[PDB]
């Protein structure tokens, strides 16, 4: 691709970038910034 | 020479976890009695 600063806006250059994410049947790596709790058991509770 | 695989080149497909169940799934696989 040629790209001059005089490109246009379909012309000029775009930085991508691609955040494939994997899925859940496998060990987590990677987390959203969430705080974390105590482990309770027997009680019904919601659970992430 | 050849020799013959029986069973042999079953992966789990996938890290997840189960028990007494039948599952069945497609992908890569060597097939059963392959001559190797």
């Known amino acids: 691709y040629g790209f001059q600063p ?33 482990l309770v058991k027997n009680k019904c509770v919601n659970f992430n | 020479a050849y020799t013959n695989s029986f069973t042999r080149g079953v992966y789990y497909p996938d890290k997840v976890f189960r028990s007494s169940v039948l599952h069945s799934t497609q992908d890569l696989f060597l097939p059963f009695f392959s001559n190797v």
């Not at chain 1, 775009?14 to 709790?37: M, N």
Request: charge should be positive; aromatic fraction near 10%; include cysteine.
């Open chain 1, 6 to 38: 005089t490109n246009g806006v379909g012309y000029q250059p775009y930085r991508v970038v691609v955040l494939s994410f994997e899925l859940l049947h496998a060990p987590a790596t990677v987390c959203g910034p969430k705080k974390s709790t105590n």
